[PDB]
Design a protein around this ligand. Structure first.
Ligand SMILES: [Fe+2]
Ligand SMILES: [Fe+2]
Ligand SMILES: [Fe+2]
Ligand SMILES: [Fe+2]
Lengths: 287, 287
């Protein structure tokens, strides 16, 4: 049985991603967020509710990525160096999830926090989107998986990392770009820096597996990937309408969702599917 | 679908272990090992071979713990806070495994290193040992597992963390306790500090599951646990004979194996099975 041997490279990129993961290491103890209270109280109830809801959805996605997406993909990866990288990325998803709780403690009472988590758990669109992604991961709960199964789990993972988070990341960025909730915005920017490299890395792994598939299996997963993108898009457009109508930001968020969907496709080596639109300037300032 | 909510505790211990994991965080770039060369070259040929072999075995066990033992246990936990802890511990096993490569780079040429990793992969006792442990993990590659299956994976994990590493840790500690290879000894001490908390934590999780089993199932896993302890012990005694005969340390290492096997049993809430003996005094100085 083989041990990981970093003296013999298994590929030309895992070491650089291993080093970058670690270089980016952080935890929530490093950024106090109590100073956000002064701008928190300047927001309206509708703005505060939207913020708490999107953070709840982000927490759900990181929970599933650390607890299912990274572990089940990594278990089935043959390359032991890449497996190492994925294990570290999965741990960072748990750091991210804990950091949202750190934000919640400043912005809400204990009872309000538990209400948000009940809202997350019962939410039909969050349940639907998380169910679609995790169905691909749960197919990997078997002793041996096919390359098509592993590829589609990696596609789902890239779509989570590079696309599904972004309807949620929009609002912290938008507020931080206006000087509001800037400490929480700093945390969100650290999370985004991690998710960006997660999506690039899993996308490299997916492209490698795809190229190993038979032509018939390639045609199958190509179609399934395009369908999945648009199945998720219909749900995202319902989610943004629900969350952002009250505060007038629906079309802005939808543009940002499309921009990030295109990045997820490019991380998979695939062509963009949405028209190019320039990033919202306030969001850009929040980044 | 539930998101992890650190505002509502799921148990009385996961937060403290989460915090301690992070408090103990390190990576190999923090300890340069080049200064060990002066004492390395003073070892005999036989001492150098034993050292490289035990490091290879340690690398294998960390490889399997980070890539199978932590991920497959964690996926099947219902407690999302405990899941988070296990994900971080699994990442640390990959840090540990990479740190052995960092030691190898100072102590051996590129060709000598690849020889050690080939020796690891083809070794019959390492294959048997790793096969026994990982069989319990691989039983979890299915959507629904029983509590007996999850409990026995946790037992196997505690035995790896608290017991199977120690026939290998002995030698870096024994040399460091004499002023030899002290920088590599510092790394091994950091690894041990991590494995010690890993074994305690997994053992707490195992005791929780055990308390939910029927009396019939409890009797069945108690029998499996005692048999596994002794199945591993027979292999460990063959392994110590093979590695340490040439340097006259077999009985010393065996005493250390038994001491650590007792600690693994205690981490599971079980009585010791080996007579109490004091730890080798040089090993104690190396700690
Ligand atoms: Fe994350
Ligand atoms: Fe991520
Ligand atoms: Fe380890
Ligand atoms: Fe460990």
């Amino acid at each position: 049985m083989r041990a990981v041997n970093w003296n013999k490279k298994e590929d030309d990129f895992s070491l650089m991603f291993w080093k970058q993961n670690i270089a980016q290491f952080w935890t929530e103890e490093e950024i106090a967020v109590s100073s956000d209270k002064n701008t928190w109280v300047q927001l309206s109830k509708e703005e505060q509710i939207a913020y708490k809801r999107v953070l709840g959805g982000l927490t759900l996605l990181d929970t599933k990525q650390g607890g299912e997406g990274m572990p089940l993909v990594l278990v089935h990866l043959e390359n032991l160096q890449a497996k190492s990288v994925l294990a570290f990325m999965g741990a960072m998803e748990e750091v991210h999830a804990k950091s949202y709780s750190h934000i919640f403690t400043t912005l809400a009472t204990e009872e309000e926090i538990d209400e948000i988590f009940d809202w997350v758990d019962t939410h039909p669109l969050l349940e639907k989107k998380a169910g679609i992604i995790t169905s691909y991961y749960r197919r990997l709960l078997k002793p041996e998986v096919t390359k098509k199964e592993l590829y589609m789990a990696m596609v789902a993972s890239v779509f989570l990392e590079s696309y599904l988070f972004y309807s949620g990341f929009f609002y912290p960025l938008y507020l931080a770009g206006q000087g509001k909730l800037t400490a929480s915005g700093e945390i969100i920017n650290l999370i985004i820096r991690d998710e960006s490299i997660h999506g690039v890395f899993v996308g490299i792994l997916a492209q490698q597996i795809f190229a190993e598939l038979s032509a018939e299996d390639q045609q199958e997963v190509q179609k399934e990937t395009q369908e999945l993108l648009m199945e998720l898009y219909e749900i995202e457009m319902a989610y943004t309408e629900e969350i952002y109508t009250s505060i007038g930001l629906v079309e802005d968020v939808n543009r940002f969702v499309r921009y990030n969907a295109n990045k997820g496709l490019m991380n998979l080596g695939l062509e963009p599917k949405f028209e190019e639109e320039e990033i919202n300037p306030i969001v850009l300032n929040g980044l």
